[PDB]
């Protein structure tokens, strides 16, 4: 009856420090549709976060893109925090430049 979200955290363009970019958190494959997603900068919640309109795949599971514009640096850590009925506690996926 329920499917847990897959989570990818990545940037719109290849990251280089000091240049403007977009931080993406793609959640997909989940059911039901209610889901809570935060983008984090050094562990704290980013306020200006937009998301795509709810749609779904051929297997009926849902997907959403959360995104915000950011400027990466070498020190700043970014992450995506997701809660869903299938998850006992929120999952935090860290942004890795290389993935």
């Amino acid at each position: 009856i329920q499917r847990t979200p897959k989570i990818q955290v990545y940037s719109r363009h290849p990251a280089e420090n000091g240049k403007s970019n977009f931080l993406n958190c793609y959640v997909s494959g989940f059911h039901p549709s209610d889901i809570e997603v935060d983008l984090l900068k050094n562990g704290e919640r980013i306020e200006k976060v937009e998301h795509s309109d709810l749609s779904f795949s051929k297997d009926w599971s849902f997907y959403l893109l959360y995104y915000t514009e950011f400027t990466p640096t070498e020190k700043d850590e970014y992450a995506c925090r997701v809660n869903h009925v299938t998850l006992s506690q929120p999952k935090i996926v860290k942004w890795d430049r290389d993935m």
């Binding site: 009856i1 977009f22 997909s28 059911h31 309109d53 599971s61």
Partner: protein
């Protein structure tokens, strides 16, 4: 090439928190172009792509009235489904609907679609003949009998073979600079040592449209299906998509591995390898 138009509806009950939310989105290929959300302060069918904005107020008013009508119908269907499955009024449930048409390069209908789901499971689907139904269970068989009695498939068939194909043709022309442009992937291979004995080769595809793509790793020309990590194709946020495929390779053996990329935007498939 070929093209498709799809509408997706989601109706989401929330007992104790108002009436079920109804959201609709429309797509051509991988490009969303309209949305409707009953939870918007002023619900309306709204543009989500530049080439639909030129449609006149009659278009937007007609689409808004239709989605309000659909919202009411699917709120009623959620109540009906509770009766069909002997379920209580206290739980939250979801109806989903997908329908639309596929056309070939010459704009003729290839295939029509109209399928529904209840709580993420198939419920009823119009068959490829656009005249009969497949019901998933004895509840959906009631709907099937109802729709057979009212000749619902005949109305869908007329829509799918007519207005659906004709509006898709119009949208494809109005948005031809984007809907009829394939953006090929920009590709490269990266290398990440894991240990003294192994390293990861990751084959990247970036900035491509449409989303359909094939990325494979071969070793000595043999596909590495079971040993390749393949992430789901993901949106970049600028229309385009991203994907990668990775293999763990023995140190020194990097050159036995080749990455193969197929995409609509590429005249010929690409073979890549790590180039230190």
């Amino acid at each position: 090439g070929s093209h498709s138009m799809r509408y997706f509806y989601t109706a989401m009950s929330r007992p104790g928190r108002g009436e079920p939310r109804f959201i609709a989105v429309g797509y051509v290929d991988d490009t969303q172009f309209v949305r409707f959300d009953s939870d918007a302060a002023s619900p309306r069918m709204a543009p989500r792509a530049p080439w639909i904005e030129q449609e006149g107020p009659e278009y937007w008013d007609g689409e808004t009235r239709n989605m309000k009508a659909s919202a009411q119908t699917y709120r009623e269907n959620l109540r009906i489904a509770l009766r069909y499955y002997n379920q209580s009024e206290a739980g939250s449930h979801i109806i989903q609907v997908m329908y639309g048409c596929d056309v070939g390069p010459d704009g003729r209908l290839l295939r029509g679609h109209d399928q529904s789901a209840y709580d993420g499971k198939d419920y009823i689907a119009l068959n490829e003949d656009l005249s009969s139904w497949t019901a998933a269970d004895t509840a959906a068989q009631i709907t099937q009998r109802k729709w057979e009695a009212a000749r619902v498939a005949e109305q869908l068939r007329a829509y799918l073979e007519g207005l659906c194909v004709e509006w898709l043709r119009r949208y494809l022309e109005n948005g031809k600079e984007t809907l009829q442009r394939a953006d090929p992937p920009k590709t490269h291979v990266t290398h990440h040592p894991i240990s003294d004995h192994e390293a990861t080769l990751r084959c990247w595809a970036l900035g491509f449209y449409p989303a359909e793509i094939t990325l494979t790793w071969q070793r000595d020309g043999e596909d590495q299906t079971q040993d390749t990590e393949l992430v789901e194709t993901r949106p970049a946020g600028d229309r385009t998509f991203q994907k990668w495929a990775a293999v763990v390779v023995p140190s020194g053996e990097e050159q036995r591995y080749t990455c193969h990329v197929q995409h609509e935007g590429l005249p010929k498939p690409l073979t890549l390898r790590w180039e230190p």
